[PDB]
A paper describes a structure:
Human [name] is a 511-amino acid protein that displays the canonical TRIM/RBCC motif followed by a [name].2 C-terminal domain. TRIM7B30.2 structure reveals the typical [name].2 domain fold consisting of two antiparallel β-sheets of seven (β1, β2, β4, β9, β10, β11, and β13) and six (β3, β5, β6, β7, β8, and β12) strands, arranged as a distorted β-sandwich. The [name]/GNIP1–glycogenin interaction was shown to be mediated by the [name].2 domain, whereas the CC domain was involved in the protein self-association.
To contribute to the understanding of the mechanism of action of [name], we solved the X-ray crystal structure of its [name].2 domain (TRIM7B30.2) in two crystal forms at resolutions of 1.6 Å and 1.8 Å. Even though the packing of the molecules in the two crystal forms is different, the structure of the four independent molecules is very similar, showing backbone root mean square deviations (RMSD) smaller than 0.5 Å for all pairwise comparisons. During the refinement process, electron density that fitted well to a malonate ion from the crystallization solution was observed in a positively charged cavity found on one side of the pocket, in all four TRIM7B30.2 molecules from both crystal forms. Malonate is in the same position in three of the four molecules (chain A from the 1.6 Å resolution structure and both chains in the 1.8 Å resolution structure) hydrogen-bonded to Thr384, Arg385 and Ser499. The most external carboxylate of malonate also forms a bidentate salt bridge with the guanidinium group of Arg487 from a symmetry-related protein molecule. Furthermore, despite almost certainly being a nonnatural ligand of TRIM7B30.2, malonate binding reveals the existence of a potential binding site for negatively charged regions of such partners. During the refinement process, additional electron densities connected to Cys378, Cys390, and Cys501 were observed in the Fobs-Fcalc map in both crystal forms. Only Cys455, whose side chain points into the core of the β-sandwich, appears not to be modified according to the electron density maps.
Author numbering: 340 to 510
Amino acid sequence: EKVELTLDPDTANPRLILSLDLKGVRLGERAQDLPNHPCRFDTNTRVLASCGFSSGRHHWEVEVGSKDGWAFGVARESVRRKGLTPFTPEEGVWALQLNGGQYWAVTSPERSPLSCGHLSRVRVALDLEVGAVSFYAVEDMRHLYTFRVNFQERVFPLFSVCSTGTYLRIW
């Protein structure tokens, strides 16, 4: 079922720029002086939605920038917030990424280069019963990639922007 997400400003890395409607995120030039919430990503340029899921099937849609430097998908609640944490499934993050002009599923120890054409808006489908996170290009709902995961805890929508000049935006 459809979920209306808002970004959680307590989690946001201080270099990120969130939109006032808490749907949009970009990377800024300099770090804002933000109160040090324990949930805040102090180093990785990440932000979670406020909503986490422990059961059921849920979907949302993400508008993506055409320029390099984003990743999104889901993170387990216990993802490390403090220090430079590897962006890997073992560290509790399951994401797609645009980097070096190439779409990737962020697998380890090697990322997986995807076949897809240019992406504009992507549906993310989280199933905690089946144990799946799936991505679709919204135009014709074409499957891009599925991670099979045995989720053991609450899972949050995850967004990351690591370059100026691109963005992610919840639809």
